[PDB]
Design a protein around this nucleic acid. Structure first.
Lengths: 83, 92, 74, 92, 76, 78, 92, 91
DNA sequence: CACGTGCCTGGAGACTAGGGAGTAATCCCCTTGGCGGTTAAAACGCGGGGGACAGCGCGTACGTGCGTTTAAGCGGTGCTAGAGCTGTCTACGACCAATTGAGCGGCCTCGGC
DNA sequence: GCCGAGGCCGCTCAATTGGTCGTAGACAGCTCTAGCACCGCTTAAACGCACGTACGCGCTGTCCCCCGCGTTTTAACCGCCAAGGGGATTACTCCCTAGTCTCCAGGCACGTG
């Protein structure tokens, strides 16, 4: 069950709504691929740290505290998912 | 079963704003914020105790941690409140 | 803003390259989605500042590149 | 049988904070003025955050703080944003 | 070093006067502060140059520095 | 004493960074930025001096102050 | 009096570049670099034992600290070298 | 014999062991932790020294000076992110 | 979501017993201050040409609407992997006393920049 | 050619090796929660296409305002001396906090208008 081409699940309207919430009025057609790349890098960093925390505790499930600690390493404190 | 600062946060709210309440999720967020600040101050105080080879953590270590982790006016007001509390505790 | 299920699939795909046969909690995926949306909104705010700087209104990939350069992200 | 929180004039638990500082292995010894100084700094910080959140809620003609109102307290005051950095609140 | 030592030392003392009266400074402290300050200003000017190039310019104005600082996060 | 950071010093710092031409209003903004940076670092350093019951600011205090800001400095007693 | 990494760094230098020498200030910088990395990997190994109620710093904690501090390929090579060293030490 | 010869390392296992004991990092230190810092604090020194020597060769020198270390830190993508914004004295 | 009532686990009072922090005395380094000479760098004025900024016209590419197609959200069922907790035992690390050589300060000597 | 990198030498404060002791961690078992897989129907969101006009971008011109240069001013910098605060170390006496047991009420869950 190989997974591939799932980066296109971040559809054009999703990126466009995110930009609208950020104040962007006009979006060029080349922003979308760049947004996919940036999101992929961010997710790679966070997931790498979270998997490190998961494998420290001898687990096969990534939990909310792992992601919270991974984000906290990045200076992106997250509240409401435990602590 | 789990220790939380719900009663004390509720009391502080009832003092600052007598006509506003808190939702359960807001209490959870406030508890998380309090725990985060407590951990940030405790870890810094431990680091200062360790660097200077001090076995004990005193009020001066906590004062320095407060002045190092909080921004300016918050640090000044927090130092004033803490000194007031420590003086009132020692005297009485 | 992002559909839940495509984001879940993307997160699992990325996690596959780091540790195989991995399982997730729903709270973990929700936390990742919240953090990712916040990060993208902040990036778009800085991108809009960069676009305003250059006297235009349409944001372009060079704006993202400059914002991430100044931010220190690689 | 007066509590250490009553001797100082606080609502946060001095004894609980001391026990947290003793079982967290921050230092092998903890003084008598460190539990009374954090329990005041934390109370002041909770009061500040609750005051700003209540102001945000009152401006929105509501009388019960909800997680969105905390995200407007911390994202209007520069000091809180510098103290917490990039802070994301759930259901906000 | 690109900044003369005596003016920087006087500036550091003048700034420190507002945090505690009657301070003494070691020579090593002023040297470290000067090195850090020069490095910080050079990095800021690099970012300002990127901002100026973005706007199709070769002359940097204060708006470039403001944008660089704002994206960095120092000014808010 | 902020005027001691003169126009050619700022110009040399800018040239070190690759700037080709400098406007006339850059100098005041640069002085303000430098003041803010020094204020933060010196505040942290003075806090560290207070912790040690001292009346002198040492190199280690400045090194620690810059470490709090992600400005690791080497060669001054590390 | 003051213990320093001076002989060790020279020994490592005369393994990769046997013909290049090194100055005293470069000793200062490398010693500072080793100290910074050591306290990083020790602080993040103590915070992985405290937040687990574990009184021991095993090799597993050091590996997790290595994977959390160092960048990707650098971390992979470091964990490889550390595992090789621990295997050799346990075997002999 | 020594604890560094068992691991085949050029760095002091015992000195790191006491630095990780007397620093009050944890109550108990394992037997394999000092032989894991020493093996990680030697790969990093090896990498930095290799890059510094490469920089020294590029400048037609036989010695590593602070300037060479700063160049090695700045050119390497990974070492720059590990140390952040590092200013090296006399660089 | 406030408000009332029973319970049980943790905070408080009193006491004694070591050891860490306060506090006084001393030594001698490093900081601060003043002064005179030289001289490198900063300041001032000026002539000019490079570039910043406004205006204008073109044609590219975006946004909005509309009809169609995709697959996401939901609600049930089913099953099993593995998270969380408890109990028991063997192995590993702290401590302490004897042994012995690696590493730090000082020197003399000698070749890269 | 000569001053900062290299090798040699004596000397104390570690690192090791060896035993013993108590307890922390590895490991085996078991109970129930929750994460994954599947299916079917609904329908909201994504998608593709068409059309118009908003605006990115290249070109042109004009004024202004940085830059390089020559001259005069000024204050940084080096060298020297004095004098004295206070950083660094050590020796002592005493007050603070850890560990224990008795005493009891604050604070967690759970049922309520």
């Amino acid at each position: 069950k190989v997974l591939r081409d799932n980066i296109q699940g971040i559809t054009k309207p999703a990126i466009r709504r995110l930009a609208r919430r950020g104040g962007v009025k006009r979006i060029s057609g080349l922003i979308y691929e760049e947004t996919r790349g940036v999101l992929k890098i961010f997710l790679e960093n966070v997931i790498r740290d979270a998997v490190t925390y998961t494998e420290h505790a001898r687990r096969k499930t990534v939990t909310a505290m792992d992601v919270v600690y991974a984000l906290k390493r990045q200076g992106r404190t997250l509240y409401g998912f435990g602590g | 079963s789990v220790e939380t600062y719900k009663i004390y946060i509720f009391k502080v709210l009832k003092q600052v704003h007598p006509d506003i309440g808190i939702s359960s999720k807001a209490m959870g967020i406030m508890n998380s914020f309090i725990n985060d600040i407590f951990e940030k101050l405790a870890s810094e105080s431990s680091k200062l105790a360790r660097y200077n080879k001090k076995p004990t953590i005193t009020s001066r270590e906590i004062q320095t941690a407060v002045r190092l982790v909080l921004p300016g006016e918050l640090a000044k007001h927090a130092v004033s409140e803490g000194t007031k509390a420590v003086t009132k505790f020692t005297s009485s | 803003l992002i559909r839940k299920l495509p984001f879940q699939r993307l997160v699992r795909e990325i996690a596959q390259d780091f540790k195989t046969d991995l399982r997730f909690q729903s709270s973990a995926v929700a936390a990742l989605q919240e953090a990712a949306e916040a990060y993208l909104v902040g990036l778009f705010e800085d991108t809009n500042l960069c676009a305003i700087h250059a006297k235009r209104v349409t944001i372009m990939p060079k704006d993202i590149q400059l914002a991430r350069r100044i931010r220190g992200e690689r | 049988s007066t509590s250490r929180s009553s001797k100082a004039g606080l609502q946060f638990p001095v004894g609980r904070i001391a026990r947290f500082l003793k079982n967290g292995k921050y230092a092998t010894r903890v003084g008598a003025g460190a539990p009374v100084y954090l329990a005041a700094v934390l109370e002041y910080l909770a009061a500040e955050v609750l005051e700003l959140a209540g102001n945000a809620a009152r401006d929105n003609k509501k009388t019960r703080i909800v997680p969105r109102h905390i995200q407007l307290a911390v994202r209007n005051d520069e000091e809180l944003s510098k103290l917490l950095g990039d802070v994301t609140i759930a259901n906000g």
